[PDB]
Structure formats: structure tokens, C-alpha cells
Amino acid sequence: MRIDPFKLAHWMNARKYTAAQTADLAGLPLDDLRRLLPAAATALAEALSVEPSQLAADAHRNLTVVHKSAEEMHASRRPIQRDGIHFYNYYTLAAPEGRVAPVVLDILCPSDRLPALNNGHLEPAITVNLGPGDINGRWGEEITPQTWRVLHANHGGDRWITGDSYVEPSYCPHSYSLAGDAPARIVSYTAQSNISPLMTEANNWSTGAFEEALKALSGKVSAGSVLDLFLARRAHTRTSAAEAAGVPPADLEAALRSPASETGLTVLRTLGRALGFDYRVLLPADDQVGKTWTTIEDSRRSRRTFGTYEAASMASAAHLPDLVGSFLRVDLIDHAENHYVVTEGRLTLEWDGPDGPASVELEPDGSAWTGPFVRHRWHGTGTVLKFGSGAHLGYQDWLELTNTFEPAATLRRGR
Amino acid sequence: MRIDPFKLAHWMNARKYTAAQTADLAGLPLDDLRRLLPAAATALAEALSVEPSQLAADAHRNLTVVHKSAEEMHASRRPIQRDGIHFYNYYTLAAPEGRVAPVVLDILCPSDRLPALNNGHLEPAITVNLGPGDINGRWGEEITPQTWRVLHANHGGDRWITGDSYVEPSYCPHSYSLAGDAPARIVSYTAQSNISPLMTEANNWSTGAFEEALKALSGKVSAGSVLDLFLARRAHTRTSAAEAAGVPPADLEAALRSPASETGLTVLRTLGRALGFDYRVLLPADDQVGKTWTTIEDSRRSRRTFGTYEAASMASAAHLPDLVGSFLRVDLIDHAENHYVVTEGRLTLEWDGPDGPASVELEPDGSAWTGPFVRHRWHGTGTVLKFGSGAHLGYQDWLELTNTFEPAATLRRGR
């Protein structure tokens, strides 16, 4: 239940209080405050008109690597009953205490029973078939080629590519059953929802404002619809904006029909510079299980050398840049979190942490987590699944970092 | 100290617990849980392995408009002593309880004393001279045309444009003094820092990982540097990525030297679709007080009719799309928060809230705040300053919303 020096300094600055004034208002010793930069937190919070949790330090500090043995993973087993049967077993992989743990599931609904759907969940997930058996994927109430498809297990020789993979779309109910008698496990790996922070806030808005938001977000969310909101925000019309930027009304209209044509882009960037906004968010993204479906063959075809490793791709979606998965056959450094699970061999994960070089040996079902920018490597022979998620550094952070003067210096200052 | 139904449901889903199991684990009545969807929070938190603040509802729910009379603003006056003199008076404008309030400052450092600098602050701010006197802006220890410039007050007839405005850059120390005998006030309006959530997390990383991050963020943060991080993340090299996408190595290299040429854009989008990332964050932003400096003349030149209002622009920066300011001479709906301060007239602010049509009359120095998407209007005659800030909906949210299938339906579901 500690105090974050960065958060404390922010609130002091926001209230425009000195350390002296802050100590005075909160009725605590000034030396305590200078050092912080449980009894202190409550007093500080009331003095700075914030909730104590607005001053709380993270429960986890200096985490590099967390790991979980195959034994501990097996011990985590929890049976799940659905539709009057034993439906799945859930196992949890390595994760920092309190964080969302990746899941392995035994698929136990037999081939002759339609798997009852779940309710869906906001987060998207990569789901991969570990095998050994093929499974059925279900995505709707009615059974159709659109709503019912077999996620194959690899039956051939390059088993480090374990099976088919796809992205479970946000919110749509889904379930799994065995396609035959052969048993099967999956890993379902969820990323953080990037729309979640917005929804959390929009949930607390008045109903009137919420309805207005939905209207502005209804239908086609185009270059034009978004731009018009940007303009109103700056008390501009399309007419005044084009004037301010030195752009002919007709070129603006042309730009908005084709934002990603370098003529569209030139106009929008000119407008963005004149009016104080980032044109990039006005550029088209791909229109919106078939698209992300990645077969065993797909993964075989994507095989490449990656440093000392051989790598193959799981399913991905351009709409979900923060969510990644790869098969790795056995230095690594990623710009956000990794979750790894060993599928073959006795592998050693080595990292450099606060206590110097460290390492753990993990057997199949054994798993690890690595923090953002934690340098690590795998030794041995040699198969691990590499998943990745995390808002930091996520693609939205990348947008902001490119808008930042000397990002490294800014980060250094905060710390 | 309430429970957020959305957060609770998220954690239950994340632990894969039913309502029954959750009630069981937390040892509370299942009817209480079904309804929630202080004694409950502590039990729930321990059951769901989260901190109670991960389940806390927002202190403010259903806020539409907050307001503060000129009298209450004047009552908020706090003198500030710096360099042995009475340096500023601080006044606070309308803001939700606990949020950052916009500030008005009396500038009291006389013309014959160099204004001692502050320490700087992470957030950028629009600062505008309210007059009636010209002031000195200071941005460095040594006095130069780069570090010392007069922020003029409007001495002429269209006083609704109050004076010069500029953006105080992130972190750089600054201060103000009178340029002459005439007194002067400023408004300094801060937006949320969009890099703040990242810094908060990076602060808790091990020193090793933090240093690695700074390396990856050091120097020119280009299309190429960012792409290479995206590739490593997906266990790709430039060679394998170009192969996977069907793109010749030479076209990729050409794309990276000119990402915003529609040939660059075509290559990067192709790569993004094949590899599962958003090409838009790879596109150039403007390279990085002279640039944002907005004179009285500038603001006069930008005058336009905006519905029933006449509007003029304050300073803006394309690097800061969430931060806005306008002079308004007297329906309004914005996609994020507004802070308004009356500079002339007895004006009526009308809004539609949870209790139906509401309104407040405000005189000069009287101020208001409006939530995102709160429909409102000003009546009377007629000058108000319109500021805008807010992460939701901010430009990063706009990037994510364009990556979302049926954003309106997703939002409706969360609520």
C-alpha cells in the first residue's frame, strides 16, 4: 500500500502546492514527504483532494520474469461444468500476481454433443489447437459453415507447429468440442482491450451524453465523420478549416473520399498542421473468423530463421496490433509483455534482472512471463509458444511517442 | 467507495468464475453479487486476486456540467511567493471535484525584476494573456530572443480576442512578469499527458528494462526504427516480413525512406495487413515557443462564424491533438471535455442533463465544465473562452475506434 513518487509530484504540481505547503495541509512531517518524493497516504490524499488510489504505487515493482513449473500448472486445474457435463478443464500459465493469466483448456465436450456457447468477452484472443485431436469451433447459435469449423491439430512431422489458430472476435459467444475421439487442449491468449479505458469512462457518463456518443460513432466511421468532429471541437466548419489551411474546398472533399491517396494525405496533413491535429487517425484502416484463420499449412509456409530460433506465425489481425503469437523452435527483447509456454524439451529461460543473470529450466506445460524490454534468451532443444500483449508500449503509445519531442529524455525525467 | 459492475464482470470473466463461484469464494450472498452486476468490495477483491481499487466505481457518475461563479473564483485566490516577492495569485476555474482545475494567475513580478523560473511540468498548456497589460514570457536561464518574448494583450477594439497565446512545452521551466506598469492576468490551461500512462508503468520496470526502452527510443524515431521493433515482436526479420507480404526488399527500403508517399503507404499497409499491425503509426508526424506562437493578429485573421457564435483560434499544436482553445463571441457538442470562462457579459449556459433542461447564469470570471458529448449552448451577449482537453474521446481513442467492428454496439454492450 505504498506511495508513487511520480503520482504524488503530479498532484502537488496540479494543486500548485510546494512540498512545504503539502506537508502543512496534510499535517505530516516535511522530511517524510521529501523522502516519499499508510497514515501518510490518507492525509496526503485529503490534502490533494484525490482518492488514495490516485497516489498508490504499483503492487509490482521491478518485475522482470515470472515463471510457473509444469507441476504448478497441472496443480492449477479447475474443472468446469456446462450443459450438465464436465465441459472444460482450465489451467493457468505464468503471470504476475493479480494480472490476467493465459489459459490452457482441456476440450472435453464430445463430438456428438453441440458445445453450449459462452457469453463472449470484450478482449480478443488468439486460440491455438495444441492437439493431439482436431476440435470443433462454434461461433453462433445456428450451425453453418460460418459458425462451425474444425480447428485442426497437426498430425504430421513438424509438431512444433501444433495446430490451426484464429482470433476470437470481441464479444461474440464461442465454444469448443472434440471433432473426434482423440483428446485435445487449446491455449487461449487474451490481450488487453484498448477500447476498455474509454468504455470505463463512457459507462459513467450521463445517459444523454452516452446516446450522443453512440450517434457520433454509429454507421461508417469515415475520414469525413471523424474530421467533422475534430472541426466542431475547434469551432471550425469545413469552410473555415479549408480557408485557415490555404486549401480549396474541392480538394478537401476529394481528400476525404480518398484519404490514403498521397494527394488525400497531403491535404489532410496540411489541415492537421494548420488546425492542430494528427492527420494519421483520419487514414483508413481495414474494413471489418475467416479473415484471421491461420492453418497448419499457413504456419509452415511462414517458417523463417529468427536469430538462433526457427519461427512460425500464428493468427494475427491488423485491427489488433498489440496481440501476437508465434511458434518458436529452439537474444530476445520485446517492446511489450511476453507469455511463453514450453511444448517440447527441457528448456532454459535466461534473463538479466535486478540481481544480474538469472535462469529457470522449464519442461512442457511450464511457462514464463517477461516484462516489456526485458532481455532474455532460450537455450536447449526446443519448442516454445510465444505470445504477446500489453498496452505499454502498445501501438497507441507508438502514435504518441512519434508526437513527442525527445521521448527518451521525457521518460528519464519521470523516473 | 462503490463497485463498478463493468470492472467486476471483467475480473470474474478473467478468473473464469461464475457469479455462483465468485459469491462462494468471496463468502458473500449471491443476490448481493447479482445486484452489484464496503464489506463486499474487500471480499470480492481477495476472491478475484485484485486490489479493491481495481473494482472501484468512479467517484463521479452522471456528471454533465459543473460551474463556478465569479465570486467563488475570486474566493479561491491563493497568493504565491517566489524569489522573496509576491509572485502570482492563483485562482481556480470550474472542474469536477478532484480533477485538475484550470488556473487564472495575476502576473505580479514587476518589469524590472527577472521572473524566477518554475521547475516545468509534464503536461503541455495553452497560456493566453487576458490583459490588460503586456507580459514577459521566460523559457530559459539566459535571456535571449529564444528564451524571452512579450505576450501581448489586445489594446484595440475587438477585446473578445484577449491577447497572444502559445503552448508551454512539456517539462521546460517557464515564468512570467509584467512587461510594463499595466497589470495583467493569464489563463493557463493544461491537457492530460498522453505519455503519462506509459511513464507510470515504465517507472515500475526494472532499471535494466528501462535502459533498453530508452535505447529503443533514443535518437530519430523513424518508420524504420519502429517497424524493426514491430518485426522483432513478431519474430520476423525485414527479409521474412517482405517475403510474407509479397513485397520486394527494395520496395520496403524505399517505403521506409518515404512512408507518406502513396507508394510508401501502399507497401506499409500491405505489410501491416500481412503481419497484423496498423501501418498508420509508422507514418511521419511533424518534426519537433515560436511554432505555436499565436498573436492577436493571428487570432483576428482566423475569425469565422461558428453556428450562432463568432470564433477565433488560440494556439494549437499538431503534436497535441487533444489540447484546444478558442475565443467565442456570443448547439455545442464536443467529443471530449470543455472548460469555459466568461470574459464579458452576463451569459447563460444551458444544457440537457439527467434532470432535463438546466441552465446557469455566469458573469466574467464565472466558469463551467462540460463532460464529453454533453449538448449545451450559450445565450446572451457575449464573450467566453473555450478550452478543451481529455483522453476520452482523445486522438488515441480515435485510432482504436477506427480499428473496431461496430464501435457503437461494443459501447452499448459495456453499459
Curated annotation (Swiss-Prot), chains A, B:
GO terms (BP aspect): antibiotic biosynthetic process; organic phosphonate biosynthetic process; phosphinothricin biosynthetic process
Catalytic activity entry: 2-hydroxyethylphosphonate + O2 = hydroxymethylphosphonate + formate + H(+)
Residues that, per the record, bind substrate: 16, 90, 118, 168, 174, 188
EC number(s) recorded for this UniProt protein: 1.13.11.72
Key words of the record: Antibiotic biosynthesis, Dioxygenase, DNA-binding, Iron, Metal-binding, Oxidoreductase, Repeat
Cleavable signal peptide: none
UniProt keyword Oxidoreductase, yes or no: yes
Coiled-coil residue windows: none
Assembly behavior: Homodimer.
Function: Non-heme-dependent dioxygenase that catalyzes the conversion of 2-hydroxyethylphosphonate (HEP) to hydroxymethylphosphonate (HMP) in the biosynthesis of phosphinothricin tripeptide (PTT), also known as bialaphos (BA), a natural-product antibiotic and potent herbicide. PTT contains the unusual amino acid phosphinothricin attached to 2 alanine residues. Synthetic phosphinothricin (glufosinate) is a key component of commercial herbicides.
Family the entry assigns: Belongs to the non-heme iron-dependent dioxygenase family.
Name under which the protein is recorded: 2-hydroxyethylphosphonate dioxygenase
Species the sequence originates in: Streptomyces viridochromogenes (strain DSM 40736 / JCM 4977 / BCRC 1201 / Tue 494)
Gene that this sequence comes from: hepD
